[PDB]
């Protein structure tokens, strides 16, 4: 019911500390959005790197494979800023409709 | 970005006075989505009649074709309330994230 917000919901989670595909997927699941799988998140996480909106600290393990840790870039700091202003707008309009 | 709410927003308009396809579509254009088309509204109306959520007063003219006037059935009343409760639900959670 909100796949549009998913791209900005993720940047929201990344805005409050270094995080990883799993932790971000779990946080979305905890919010009530249990329909999504790890993969769906990573496939947006890849997209956000391509577009330049996240920064990457690749972290190694002797216990398993390497995980990526995600941070907002200045561009992503900006793009998230826009996303919310977009939300505020639409809620506000619906509000006056009601 | 609101093509799914379009059905509920129309029921919202029908809730405050008897009304007709054009007035509905114009009200929509006044709300802001000027991507709307008179046609797009009528198809939804037609579906709403068939779902049993609106009531028809067909009104004639010697000036041109007849126009159906729409008002809410008791079911449409119920259905619109369900939609608002849903917006409330989703606005609340989004804003909690925010």
DSSP string, chain A: --HHHHHHHHHHHHTTS-B-HHHHHHHHHHTT-TT--HHHHHHHHHHHHHTT-EEEEEE--SSSSPEEEEEE-HHHHHHHHHHHHHHHHHHHHHHHH-
Give the Cα separation of B81 and B56 in Å (integer): 20
B93 contacts on A by Cβ (under 8 Å) = 31-32
Question: CA dist B21 to A10, A69, B2, Å?
Answer: 40, 52, 19
For residue A9, the chain B residues in CB contact (below 8 A) are 97
Q: What CA–CA distance (Å, rounded) separates A93 from B31? A: 7
- Verify whether the Cβ–Cβ distance A98 to B12 is below 8 Å: yes
Map out the domains of chain A with their CATH numbers: 1-98 (1.10.10.10)
Separation in Å, CA of B68 to nearest CA in chain A:
23
């Amino acid at each position: 019911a909100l796949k549009g917000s998913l791209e900005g919901m993720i940047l929201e989670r990344i805005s409050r500390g270094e995080t990883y595909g799993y932790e971000i997927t779990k946080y979305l699941n905890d919010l009530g959005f249990d329909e999504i799988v790890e993969g769906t998140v990573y496939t947006i996480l890849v997209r956000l790197e391509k577009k330049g909106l996240v920064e990457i600290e690749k972290k190694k393990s002797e216990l398993g494979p390497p995980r990526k840790f995600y941070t907002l870039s200045p561009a992503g700091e900006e793009e998230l800023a826009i996303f919310w202003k977009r939300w505020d707008f639409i809620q506000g309009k619906i509000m006056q409709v009601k």
